[PDB]
Amino acid sequence: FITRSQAVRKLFYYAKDIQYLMHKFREHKTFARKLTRALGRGEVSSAKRLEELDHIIKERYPSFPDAIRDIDDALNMLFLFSNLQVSSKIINDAQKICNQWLAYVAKERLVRKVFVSIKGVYYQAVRWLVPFKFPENVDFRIMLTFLEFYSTLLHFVLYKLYTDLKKDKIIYDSPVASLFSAFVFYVSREVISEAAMDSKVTHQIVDRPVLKRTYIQPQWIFDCINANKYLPGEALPPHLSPW
Amino acid sequence: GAYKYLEELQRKKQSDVLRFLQRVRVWEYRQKNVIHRAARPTRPDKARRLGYKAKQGFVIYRVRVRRGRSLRATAEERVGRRAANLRVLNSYWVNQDSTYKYFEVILVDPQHKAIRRDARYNWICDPVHKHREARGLTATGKKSRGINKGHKFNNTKAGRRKTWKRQNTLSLWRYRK
Amino acid sequence: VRAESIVAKTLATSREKERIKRVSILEDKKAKNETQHIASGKDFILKEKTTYDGKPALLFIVRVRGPLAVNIPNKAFKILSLLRLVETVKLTKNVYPLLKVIAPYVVPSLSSIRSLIQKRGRIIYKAEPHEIVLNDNNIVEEQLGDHGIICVEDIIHEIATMGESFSVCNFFLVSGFGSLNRLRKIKQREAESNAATAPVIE
Amino acid sequence: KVPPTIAQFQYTLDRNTAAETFKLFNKYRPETAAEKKERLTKEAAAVAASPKPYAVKYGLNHVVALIENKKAKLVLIANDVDPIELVVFLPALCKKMGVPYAIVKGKARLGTLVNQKTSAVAALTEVRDEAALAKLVSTIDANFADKY
Amino acid sequence: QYDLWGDSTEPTNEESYNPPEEYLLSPEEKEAWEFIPQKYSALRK
RNA sequence: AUGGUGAA
RNA sequence: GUUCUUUGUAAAGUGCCUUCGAAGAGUCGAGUUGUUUGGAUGCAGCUCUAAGUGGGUGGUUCCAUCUAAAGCUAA
RNA sequence: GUUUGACCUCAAAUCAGGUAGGAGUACCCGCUGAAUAUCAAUAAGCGGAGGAAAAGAAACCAACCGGGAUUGC
After folding, report:
1. How are strands ordered across the β-sheet holding B87-96?
2. CATH topology assigned to domain D1-148
3. Considering only CA atoms, which of D2, C78, A169 is closest in space to residue B18?
4. Which of D98, D62, D63, D97 shows the shortest CA–CA distance to D77?
């Protein structure tokens, strides 16, 4: 059998399924030398003129349901980058993709399980994870390529899902959907949000020791998904993982 | 134009500047193969007046021939044999020394579409021009053949063999004269 | 090193020093309200031209890192050291005369402010110079909870709002090389490119 | 040790004045093929009174045509031309015509500023900036002709 | 932007922020551990 | 005489 | 013959006036050595190597005729 | 700059688009070539083309009141 290094150089694996697989990344290398030539010439107009994975997605995932196999890692990487030498535009695009996915999920409310953990707030639709909104204290090139591939896959996934503006300046099927319906919550500094300040609500959410719209903690919602025992200031239950 | 200055400078062949240039160039060529592709002619005026043009289709070759079938004819034959797909148009002297004499020959490729579509150069694409040096149709070949006008070339004006055949034939008409 | 660099440095320093001197003289004369020998007695700020309202508005500060040829003067050095903006308060009547001086060396909504605060996350902590990250909210409570800050979100809200943590927190809180990165920098140079009486440029 | 007509090269404009000359010449870069094509297309679309353009003269035959007419004010000559005979006489022609000349190392460097891979010579006839050209000519003269 | 597929035929480890004290590893065993469940007052802390 | 053949 | 197109301040020609007005170098040529001619010519190794109102071919002071050292072209 | 670019030169690719050998040979072109004058620029040999080939529009012929590409009779 051809060794991995030997097969890569020619292009342990089966030669039968690898030899035929030998068939723009290589051609892009010419752009570097063209840019160097333009820089040497000392004129930028030619450089501007020179400046002016769908195929792999289908073979890897011939059908939309097959995407679920890698959707775990895809969402993990996308959410990790959404909160993270990656360019700022890449971070913005990753954040936008995650926000669109969350908005679509909320539109259908296709959520079944949740678990707040030290690593992050776990979720289930398929399981996915997002870290906290805090700064994160390795070769990012691999991470960049993985992010690009996962974003390309998620673009088609979101297109399929959707087929089937001053807020930007501020930012039945299951018990989760059945429960909390019409229960308009009010969230304090820790549905209407107090952060926007910078009533028809039936419940109010606040975790501070001192308080003045029933006072409930998010642990109530978490446990119900997974004010009986969640009044403000009281000890919360063990919060065991639903899985 | 500058080409007049180049011609005038080349007129004084024995000038110390041209002596230095020639001795440098011969030494440089001595480290190269007998026949090799030349990037550009070393005598642009001579090539230009010989019909060479800097366009896709023309090729310049430098060939070395032993001193002492003229040397230019031998060089043309060698370049034609090596450059079978190209047609030899003309050649000019570029250097000499006690051991070797160097000539530059310009060739035109009839296969290149540039030459084929060139109204001023597509004539060489005709099959009758194949291996011009072989039949002595080049400038050096014609000169060696004695082709010219006047009494000095009466016996070799056009064909040294043809006149012998003409003067050896016995023309007989239907009605004898 | 060739004399051209030092010559250019001296010329730029002299020009910018004269520019700052005229600004300081104009501000001093305006403080006296003797609008009889100055081009403009009022104040302006440029986004377009906008009048400088007396309201102490708070806006983010950005560093432009230049003009490079202008060696920073002593006054600008001290102003940047006090504001620790040398590395690459509010808009009050007493702060404007000093902000205008460093105007050539320097230049929001809840969405931008919250992200900036939650991403940069500088926290002076005890080695002594530790400033790593907003590690835990309990750190803010221990170091700053006495002022009514139970978490960094309180600091964000009080910065967005006209609170006291906006002032208190001051004591608590294309960029590449290679051929490929030269064209982007050259393009950005066009956006990268000042009268004393002119309005402040934002 | 070579004939005096040779070795006039290898003595060239200093780094500072050469850089100044290159900076001055870069201002008059001729309109490249793409720029000229797009400008002509724009003009045709607008059609579907004009000032004389300014650019550097670099063609050896064209430059020699401008030289000996006394129109050329400053000429740059490459010192690495393989057919040295093409440029051996140019300095003498310029001296006879009283046209200041400057030898700049590198034909490739000379051509890089005229949108060409290589350029044997470059000359300026018209100017936008005359004081700068005169100062550069005086500096080149004092640093090259009076020295060598 | 297009339907490239159409019709076709082809876990946590109890690391909660407020877990039972038994889950939390003892300080002595933390040396041998060289993610751990930890006890916190609430989500904000 | 010209050009080839085989033969130690 | 029949039918669509031209165009673009596009390209040429005629007579006049006016200002200018380039020309194939290791080439011609002489020497010598091999070669051809019934021609003394030409061909060929090599020392040297020509000028621009210049050069080549012919005769009694020169007068007659062309502008070589590039190439294409049916009968 | 204890670097990064402009070219120029030289190699390689089962690279893309192309051409060259050789055959025939009465005629054509060149080289060579026997049995000091004669058989002889023949015989034989080698190389290069077409239906024809070569040559071809004078540094020509003439010494005339001049003719004006080459080729054949």
Report:
1. B35-38, B58-66, B100-108, B87-96
2. 60s Ribosomal Protein L30; Chain: A; (3.30.1330)
3. D2
4. D63
Q: Which of B105, B108, B135, B102 is nearest to B25 (CA)?
A: B102
Kindly identify which residue of chain E lies nearest to residue C140, measuring between CA atoms: E45
Q: What is the resolution of this structure in A?
A: 3.3
* D124 within 8 A of D56, measured Cβ to Cβ: yes
Which tokens in the block code for residue D141? 């003269």
Nearest-CB residue to A42 (from D34, D35, D112): D112
Q: Using CB atoms, which residue from B2, B17, B42 is nearest to D6?
A: B17
Question: What residue numbers bound the domain in which C139 lies?
Answer: 1-202
Any idea which nucleotide's C1' is nearest the CA of B134? H48
Determine the Cα–Cα distance for residues B88 and B79; give it in Å rounded to an integer.
Answer: 8
Q: What gap in Å lies between CA A180 and CA A200, rounded to an integer?
A: 15
Q: Is A97 within 8 Å of A89 (Cβ atoms)?
A: no
Q: Helix %, strand %, coil % for chain D, to 5?
A: 45, 10, 45
- Taken in order A184, A190, A196, A198, the sign of the CA dihedral is positive
Q: What kind of fold does domain B1-177 have according to CATH?
A: Ribosomal protein L15e (3.40.1120)
How many domains does chain C fold into?
A: 1
Using the CA of B128, give the nucleotide whose C1' is nearest.
Answer: H49
Rounded to the nearest 10 degrees, the angle between the axes of helix C152-160 and helix C110-120 is 140
Query: Long-range contacts made by residues A135-140, C-beta under 8 angstroms, separation at least 24?
Result: A135/C118, A135/C119, A135/C120, A135/C121, A135/C133, A135/C134, A136/A83, A136/A84, A137/C132, A137/C133, A140/A85, A140/A86
Record the tokens describing residue B67, joined without a space. Answer: 């001193």
> How far apart (Å, rounded) are the C-alpha atoms in residues A168 and C111?
7
According to the entry, how was the structure determined? cryo-EM
- DSSP E strands: which ranges in chain C? 44-46, 49-51, 200-201
Instruction: Provide the greatest CA pair distance for chain D.
Output: 65
Q: In the structure, how far is the CA atom of residue B31 from the C1' atom of nucleotide H9, in angstroms?
A: 14
Contact E20 A238 (CB under 8 A): yes
Query: How many whole angstroms separate alpha carbon C63 and alpha carbon C103?
Result: 10
**φ and ψ at A113, to 5 degrees?**
-140, 150
Cβ contact (<8 Å) for A42 and D26?
A: yes
Give which of A121, A120, A150 is closest to A136, Cα–Cα: A120
User: Which residues 6+ apart lie within 8 Å of A46 measured at CB?
Assistant: A38, D32, D34
Residue C51 token pair: 């009048």
| Contact in structure between D70 and D128 (CB atoms under 8 Å) | no
Give me the sign of the Cα torsion angle B94, B96, B100, B101. Answer: positive
- Domain layout of chain B by residue ranges: 1-177
Positive or negative torsion for Cα C109, C112, C113, C118: positive
Q: Which two tokens stand for residue D36?
A: 């000229």
